[PDB]
Symmetry: D2
Subunit: 456 residues, 4 copies
Amino acid sequence: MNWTVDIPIPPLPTDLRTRLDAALAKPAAQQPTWPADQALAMRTVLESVPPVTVPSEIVRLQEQLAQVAKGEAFLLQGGDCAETFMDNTEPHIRGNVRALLQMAVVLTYGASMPVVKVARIAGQYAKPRSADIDALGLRSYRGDMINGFAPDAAAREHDPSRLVRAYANASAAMNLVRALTSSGLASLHLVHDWNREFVRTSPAGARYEALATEIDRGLRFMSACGVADRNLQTAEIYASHEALVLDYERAMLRLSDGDDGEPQLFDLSAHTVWIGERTRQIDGAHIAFAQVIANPVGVKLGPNMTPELAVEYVERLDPHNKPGRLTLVSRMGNHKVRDLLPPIVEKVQATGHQVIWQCDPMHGNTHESSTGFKTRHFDRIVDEVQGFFEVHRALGTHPGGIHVEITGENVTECLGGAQDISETDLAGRYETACDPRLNTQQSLELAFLVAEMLRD
Amino acid sequence: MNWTVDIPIDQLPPLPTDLRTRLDAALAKPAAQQPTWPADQALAMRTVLESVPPVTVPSEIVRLQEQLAQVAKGEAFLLQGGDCAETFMDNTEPHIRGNVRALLQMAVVLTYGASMPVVKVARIAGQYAKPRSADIDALGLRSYRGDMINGFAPDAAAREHDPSRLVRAYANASAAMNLVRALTSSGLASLHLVHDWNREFVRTSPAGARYEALATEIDRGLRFMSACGVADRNLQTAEIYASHEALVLDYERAMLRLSDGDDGEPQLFDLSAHTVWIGERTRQIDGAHIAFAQVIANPVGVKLGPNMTPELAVEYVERLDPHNKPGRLTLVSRMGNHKVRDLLPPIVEKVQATGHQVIWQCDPMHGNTHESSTGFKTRHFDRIVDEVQGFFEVHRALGTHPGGIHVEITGENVTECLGGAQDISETDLAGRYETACDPRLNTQQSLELAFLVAEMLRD
Amino acid sequence: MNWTVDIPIDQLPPLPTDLRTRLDAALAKPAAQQPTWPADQALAMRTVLESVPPVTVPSEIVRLQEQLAQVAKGEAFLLQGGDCAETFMDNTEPHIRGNVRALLQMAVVLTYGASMPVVKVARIAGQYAKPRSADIDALGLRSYRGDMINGFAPDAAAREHDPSRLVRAYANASAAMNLVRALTSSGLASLHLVHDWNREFVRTSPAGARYEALATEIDRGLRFMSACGVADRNLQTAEIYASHEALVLDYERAMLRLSDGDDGEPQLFDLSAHTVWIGERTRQIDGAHIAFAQVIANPVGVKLGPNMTPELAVEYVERLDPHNKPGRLTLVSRMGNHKVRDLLPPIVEKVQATGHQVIWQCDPMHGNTHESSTGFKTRHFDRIVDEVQGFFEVHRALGTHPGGIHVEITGENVTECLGGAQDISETDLAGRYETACDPRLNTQQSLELAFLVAEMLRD
Amino acid sequence: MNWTVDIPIPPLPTDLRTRLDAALAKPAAQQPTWPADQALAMRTVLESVPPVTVPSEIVRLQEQLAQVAKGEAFLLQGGDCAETFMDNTEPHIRGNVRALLQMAVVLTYGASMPVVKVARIAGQYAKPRSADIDALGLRSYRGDMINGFAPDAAAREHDPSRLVRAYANASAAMNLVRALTSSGLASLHLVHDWNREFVRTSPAGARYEALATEIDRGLRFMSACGVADRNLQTAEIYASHEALVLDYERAMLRLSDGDDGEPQLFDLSAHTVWIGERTRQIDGAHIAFAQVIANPVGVKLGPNMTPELAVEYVERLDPHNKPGRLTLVSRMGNHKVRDLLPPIVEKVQATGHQVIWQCDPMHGNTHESSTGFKTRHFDRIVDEVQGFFEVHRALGTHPGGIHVEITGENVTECLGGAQDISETDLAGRYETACDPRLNTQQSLELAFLVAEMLRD
Ligand SMILES: N[C@H](Cc1c[nH]c2ccccc12)C(=O)O
Ligand SMILES: N[C@H](Cc1c[nH]c2ccccc12)C(=O)O
Ligand SMILES: N[C@H](Cc1c[nH]c2ccccc12)C(=O)O
Ligand SMILES: N[C@H](Cc1c[nH]c2ccccc12)C(=O)O
Ligand SMILES: N[C@H](Cc1ccccc1)C(=O)O
Ligand SMILES: N[C@H](Cc1ccccc1)C(=O)O
Ligand SMILES: N[C@H](Cc1ccccc1)C(=O)O
Ligand SMILES: N[C@H](Cc1ccccc1)C(=O)O
Ligand SMILES: [Mn+2]
Ligand SMILES: [Mn+2]
Ligand SMILES: [Mn+2]
Ligand SMILES: [Mn+2]
């Protein structure tokens, strides 16, 4: 059966209405194709819901991301490639939040500064496609906000009812993320006890034992110095997703009050969003929509990026020079990061703006296995981050963070790591609805390796 | 042409067998006020709810339990409040924010006046159902049972009992709860900000002069904390818990979950809310609501009206608090202001004698409802104040703790209850009578009442 | 047969040459009220003091400076108090504890009433000297100049000026300061405990009824903090700073030390105290006290009596606050209650006009001293209250900050000042007139005055 | 010249007066010989002074020492062998406090629990002697509370005026210890920066670099976790001295209020005191005076101690079984600690009392050099602590702490350590008025070594 929602029956200031209309009249790639009257109806509903986030959390994220930009904190961004309606369950959510928290404790120690924790959750329900027609000859699956994963024509029709289903799934998950992080799951001592169990049972546990012991002693030190533990009991986890579907993003806009300067438009589907490689057209609607909202935004930069084009994103998206307003996410592939990134970094640094430089070591290293599965090699992922570190150290700039696809589940999607996942093993638990994710073990292992990168 | 959007539903281990076996035994009891829809459809919706993200988590409920234990011991005070009936249509950011705001305002004043913590519980995120007296409504239509069951609109189609609503209810509850959590951790519940709203109310209210001393005195108490250099993090956020009447057993049972036993034994919680209560209509001693309440580990409350006997109250205590956990059980009295002074004392004496430690909570609003000449179901402010007054006098005389209050309020400037300082009359009621069920004290009246009760606490 | 014990003295780099050269230039100025003892003996005692452990350290003084800057800006309030003249004989644990206690009691009340922090400064640990008018005392003996200089006892031998006292003074100052630090970090200065003493005073005082509302209101302010879950460490201890009139330049100069320049440039501090002031007798503009004050980095104060002109006050400001550091300089007014309203305004206007930010502090006690029929030098409570009243009215009218008070008090139940709620009369004075110099408000009177001044702060 | 104090011109409850009189009528070894009328006069003065400590600090020390006794904190006790009137100066005091704080940070890290810091200060002005007549043929110097260090008959006369001079010097120093620890000298970050400078310049700095870096990262971790730093800004340092001169100790008694049970006698010359080898007669006045006061007390136990005698001290001095009330200080010599301590520990553990076991690795290892100077070898000191650790690990009991003689000054009194102080070097800066102390460098080095003992 179905559940069914009623379509409901003070205007923006003029300049925001004009700028917003202007931004949305620009070309927009990768949009779903569904009737405009039905999309309007869905938007009317989403214009009336409880937002997923609120403005003052977003100004707080901004301030924390400014610290990152200045070289005083570090950003960790992670979760599923594609969340699905069917896996939006308590265990799946709790496990991803847990996977992210584990990595955080280790990176916090290794960087010797705060880690801003941003999950890819409560909203990554859509994806772009290079091909409208997939390898089975079906209309491509573009994520659950648009259509269905199942391989059949009917399920692949673009269905606007999904926009509301997506909000409903986002809100519920977010509710649970908030409950879990303020309720004990994000207690530092508890999270660190899970890291100890992993060191104990991982096949490469011995390799990571020193670092884990040193973290354990750091914690006991705090306790020994009688420091208050209130701040150890909870953590903040922000939500993020690629802003891809403009029907969804525009219905989730809300105007803030003037309790901070003038009223502004915030996208309250998330705390921060980014724009992918296939929608980053400089004169396109995604970049223009990003210029209009006050959220922190990110732009993915791949191997054809030029230094001049990167400067142009910075001048469009960070025109007031607010450190941390903009994050540039490098995804070049490991074999190319060392050569392609430096000139982009030098040129952007020369502008006097303060962007966060973030490494996406996953997307630029995807390949197909002999066994059929889309996959990435652990060592290639590690090595991109390694080269990202080297590029920054040579230029004296801040390696700001990482952006990774992970899960808390024990899936077999990426080859290698300590568990030595082979081409054979991939068939066991290849569960992603899109790209291959790091395992819970692999995601934690990578945090150990990166901590070392931070320590040297 | 329907003005509706259909949202498809797409059909985790079950609860363990020993718990399922106890739970089956309990829900075999008869259940009053249940929705009349097909069992096979109800099952299907329950199956969906059995696998969604819960609205609350167990360790928030163990923390509420501990705070309610302090209430039961006379060391905190319980404030419980919100809409009589939430609807899907008004489950919006501004309505939610205004109710949360109204509850916080009252809390600052009651905190000061009681000189002890206030456990703040709001009736939101799941209060979408109601019982009925009447088979058929005055319009000759099947009665409205709340949005979890059917539609308010006066037409046959909307009044059919629609199990899809079980899911729509969960979706609305989860979204509202999300927003309550955001707002209370993000600045809306900053003490200084909330108190500035109380100051604007004092400057503005027609009776502002009456409340001025208390407001100034609270202001100085705040400025003192700052002066002493102890204005810490704790002033910037507050906890607001969720509660609703547990009425629809299909909803409540599908939202049961087992705690993971990392901080005790594995237990059964209803994760549709932090705490729930059982209304007058469904509190049959051998009925399924009371048995459901015994089974879950959440704190629970039972409403007690004018026909309550002391022996029946004792039986609730022995059924629902059998392990003697202070604060596990709250007894709410809604006897009407003219009767509270006579009816409550013997009930209190008898329950005290059992050696259990219940929270005694006053529901002033329910026992004092009447119809106006102008049509509208309404309650009079002075009757509400006066029931709380008498509730305080009863406890004073017995040396027991007046534990808290349970009120129906909103942040909106509605005209549903007569009186208060704005002097709402019978003809004013027509202006903004917006409730989908009982009349709710408006934002000014709800705050005024908190001043009056603070005075009660102090003397 | 002497009733005395001789304690032998046994004779670190010097201060740097550039500072010594400036300091020599300054102390070549003439110095009023100095002790008449041999220079070679004074040198020897100074040599001993140049190498003892200081009484205070520089970073406490930089912290006092910052807190006094908040006073000067209208964001805190300064309370300064203790004995007129400490003696060696009464420099005991119970006397010290009772004075510290009296000051803390007043502070809680003034904190509440001012709704802002109180910088607590006590006249102890070094206030062992006094100026004189009279060559010869009424007994035909050389005058008593305080225990740093000679003996109180009425006999020629004791009245000889004895430089050994410089060391005895340091030893007593250091021991008393040790005990002040212990007591304030160890529980005597717990806010809840101090306030319970104020409650016992209210229950007991003959005017207790008059002060009851304010005391209850403070109690509720405290209970609020606890209710809000912010009753932190900061309520358990308080800082009390030391101060005395810098009169004897042999003492003060030997206690100079250079800060180590790990938190700024190297500077010269007088580490006999945190802050010192210069009295009416020694404030000559071209004299050595004012020049000594300019040279040290401590906060300093200057007493201003009824002959002060606005131009002379401006000159103090330009000499002592030449870098415009708010709170570096405090101007204290002791003009008598009958004259404060007329004399102070023009002084304030003129100093404000300079663009400097001084602390304006009231010394109610000094300008209101008289002799009773019964013999005793005394002050009347009502005159003291009334000078502070007028000091408040002056500042109100000009829109300037009444910055604080400077009072002579003790924790003992002495009978030195007439009036207050105990209604001390001329014949009661004989009972316990124990001061070695001016009359001091007793513990009840000192607390009563804090209530009255809190009322002044609030309106 | 001299300064001169006037002799001044509510009784104890009867039972305390009786118990106290009883205790002082017992034999008392090592007392000064000076006229009783003059001693009375001095006592009359000291009965009237501001105490050096107050009772509620002593109940707080007690509670913290109970944690030590239970295996949950660790005790560090240290300072000069003999303080003198002439070296009671701001730099000397600040340096000893600093030396103790440096060791503390390192031991706090290494033990992973709190360190109770107790200085031997504001009162160790007296010492016992084995010989009344020293090697020069003079009346022995017994410390500045009794007589003068200078080698001449006159200065060695026992002078009761010194009792008051001692209080005056104690009070002043204590004042300064309180000021310094609440004012910034005991800021953790500042103390740890001194440890970094020492690692950088010590000849064995490389050996200690790992541990120092690991502490540095532990501190930055706290900062990275946003923990409140108020408790990092100050430390508590308690005062202690051997209770040797009963004329001094008895004049510094004060009766507490009944704000905690019944009124009791506290010795307010210090927070805690101990009884040396030469005054610990079981039926002597020192042990009996210790039974009467409520302060935490310690008893030094040397190589002739039997297990039965140790049990008897425990039953006399800890008769109510208050954990931490009594500390037994082992000083056996390194060659003997392994053999002599175990049976003493087993027997005392069997009583069910909970004493603190503390190692004094200095006294049992003193020897004379060819060059004339009384001295101890660094390696012997380290090795006693090593064997003290081994004895406890084998029995599963808590190595509770150490008691050492140190200074902040760069003296040459103990041979060895990284600076490799030789017999020749001793002549340079042999400044102690009694036993040889560890250097600032040597004292810190020993804290590194002990941290390792704690870590393994
Ligand atoms: N203040 C918190 C500390 C914290 C609590 N849990 C975790 C888990 C992982 C890293 C850090 C923390 C914070 O840093 O967000
Ligand atoms: N610790 C919070 C104090 C608080 C913060 N905001 C409000 C609003 C209303 C009452 C109290 C508070 C608490 O007591 O819950
Ligand atoms: N933080 C302290 C508060 C305090 C503690 N004891 C007292 C006694 C009197 C006044 C204040 C306090 C302070 O304000 O200094
Ligand atoms: N709470 C303090 C922490 C501390 C501050 N300074 C130091 C110096 C050495 C060791 C510890 C500390 C404490 O542990 O006493
Ligand atoms: N798994 C979710 C269940 C859900 C229903 C309604 C709201 C939120 C979640 C879905 O299929 O949409
Ligand atoms: N007003 C809500 C809007 C809503 C839709 C979906 C989920 C949550 C809320 C409703 O009509 O159901
Ligand atoms: N009353 C003090 C006692 C004292 C003696 C020595 C030092 C400190 C205080 C005196 O007569 O000097
Ligand atoms: N060095 C101290 C100086 C001193 C004098 C008086 C009191 C305290 C210390 C002495 O010789 O006694
Ligand atoms: Mn992906
Ligand atoms: Mn109702
Ligand atoms: Mn005076
Ligand atoms: Mn020694």
